[PDB]
Enzyme design. Structure first.
Site, PDB file in Angstrom:
ATOM      1  N   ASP A  10       0.992  -1.237  -0.265  1.00  0.00           N
ATOM      2  CA  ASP A  10      -0.056   0.244   0.136  1.00  0.00           C
ATOM      3  C   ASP A  10       1.081   1.501   0.087  1.00  0.00           C
ATOM      4  O   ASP A  10       0.963   1.349   0.714  1.00  0.00           O
ATOM      5  CB  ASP A  10      -1.035   0.121   0.979  1.00  0.00           C
ATOM      6  CG  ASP A  10      -1.711   1.487   1.122  1.00  0.00           C
ATOM      7  OD1 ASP A  10      -2.220   1.947   0.162  1.00  0.00           O
ATOM      8  OD2 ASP A  10      -2.944   0.995   2.061  1.00  0.00           O
ATOM      9  N   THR A  11       1.382   2.048  -0.943  1.00  0.00           N
ATOM     10  CA  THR A  11       1.870   2.922  -1.711  1.00  0.00           C
ATOM     11  C   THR A  11       0.405   4.357  -0.914  1.00  0.00           C
ATOM     12  O   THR A  11       1.288   5.833  -0.161  1.00  0.00           O
ATOM     13  CB  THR A  11       2.266   3.859  -2.908  1.00  0.00           C
ATOM     14  OG1 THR A  11       0.128   3.462  -3.669  1.00  0.00           O
ATOM     15  CG2 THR A  11       2.827   2.432  -3.292  1.00  0.00           C
ATOM     16  N   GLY A  12      -0.174   4.213   0.038  1.00  0.00           N
ATOM     17  CA  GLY A  12      -1.020   5.481   0.492  1.00  0.00           C
ATOM     18  C   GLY A  12      -1.049   4.849   1.942  1.00  0.00           C
ATOM     19  O   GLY A  12      -1.388   6.228   2.766  1.00  0.00           O
TER      20      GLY A  12
END
Ligand SMILES: CC(C)CN(C[C@@H](O)[C@H](Cc1ccccc1)NC(=O)O[C@H]1CO[C@H]2OCC[C@H]21)S(=O)(=O)c1ccc(N)cc1
Ligand SMILES: [Cl-]
Ligand SMILES: [Cl-]
Ligand SMILES: [Cl-]
Ligand SMILES: [Cl-]
Ligand SMILES: [Cl-]
Ligand SMILES: [Cl-]
Ligand SMILES: [Cl-]
Ligand SMILES: [Cl-]
Ligand code: NA
Ligand SMILES: [Zn+2]
Ligand SMILES: [Zn+2]
Ligand SMILES: [Zn+2]
Ligand SMILES: [Zn+2]
Ligand SMILES: [Zn+2]
Ligand SMILES: [Zn+2]
Ligand SMILES: [Zn+2]
Ligand SMILES: [Zn+2]
Ligand SMILES: [Zn+2]
Lengths: 99, 99
Positions: free
Chosen positions: B25-27
Site C-alpha cells: 500500500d503506497t497510500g
C-alpha cells in the site's frame, strides 16, 4: 515518472478543472476526493476504510489531468482525510508497483 | 516482480514466522496488521483514515519475510480490517511506483 516511496507519492491534479493534492494509493480500489463540487449527477455509494464506512457521491466519466496525462475515470466525493487516486485511476494511467 | 494494479496487490508475508496476507500500500505511511500478538513492548499510537481512527500498538525491529526478502521493520498492531504493508516496508524492500 518514478516514486521511490521514501516520501508520500503525492502529486497535484485537476478534476474537471478543479485543482487538488492527491495521494497515489495502491491500497485503494476507488478514488475518493473531498471538497470538490462535481454537481448533482451522481449515484450514492458506500465506501469502507480503516475506520469504518462513509457515504460517497459517485461521478462517472470525469475528466482528470495528472502526471501530464488526461484520462476519464470514476471519482467518488466524500469525507476522506487525504484525497486518493486508487487503482481505477492508476490502471488508466498505466502505473505499476515494481521490485 | 511487477504488480500491475488491475487487482489488489496482495502477497503472503511471514511476521515473526506467522503467515499473513498483506496489501502492498503506497497510500499508507506505516504498516498495520491484525490478529498477531507482538507483546508488551510497544508505543500506543492512533492512526486515521477513511471512516475514522483506530488505536494501534507500535512495535520496532520486527522480523518480516515477504517477496523473497527478509527485513526488520516497524509494525503496528490494531483492529484494522485488512493487513497493510505501507511505505516503511516497501522502501526497505526497494519497491517503487512507476508510470
Ligand atoms: C486513506 C489513505 C490515506 C490511508 N489508508 C491506506 C489506504 O490504502 C486504505 C487501505 C485499506 C484497504 C481496504 C480496507 C481498509 C483500508 N484504502 C482505502 O481506504 O481505500 C478505500 C477507497 O478504495 C476502497 O478500496 C479499499 C477500501 C476503500 S489507511 O488504511 O487509512 C492507513 C492509514 C495509515 C496507515 N499507517 C496505514 C493505513
Ligand atoms: Cl522518494
Ligand atoms: Cl524523499
Ligand atoms: Cl484544467
Ligand atoms: Cl471497486
Ligand atoms: Cl455501494
Ligand atoms: Cl459501483
Ligand atoms: Cl469500498
Ligand atoms: Cl516508465
Ligand atoms: Na515495555
Ligand atoms: Zn525521495
Ligand atoms: Zn483541463
Ligand atoms: Zn501535502
Ligand atoms: Zn470499490
Ligand atoms: Zn469501493
Ligand atoms: Zn462504480
Ligand atoms: Zn521463511
Ligand atoms: Zn473489531
Ligand atoms: Zn513510463
Amino acid at each position: 515518472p518514478q516514486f521511490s516511496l521514501w516520501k508520500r507519492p503525492v502529486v497535484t491534479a485537476y478534476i474537471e478543472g478543479q485543482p487538488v493534492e492527491v495521494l497515489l494509493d495502491t491500497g485503494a480500489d476507488d478514488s475518493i476526493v473531498a471538497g470538490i463540487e462535481l454537481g448533482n449527477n451522481y449515484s450514492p455509494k458506500i465506501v469502507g476504510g480503516i475506520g469504518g464506512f462513509i457515504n460517497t457521491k459517485e461521478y462517472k466519466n470525469v475528466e482528470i489531468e495528472v502526471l501530464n496525462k488526461k484520462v476519464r475515470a470514476t471519482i467518488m466525493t466524500g469525507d476522506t482525510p487525504i484525497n486518493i487516486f486508487g487503482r481505477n485511476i492508476l490502471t488508466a494511467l498505466g502505473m505499476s508497483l515494481n521490485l
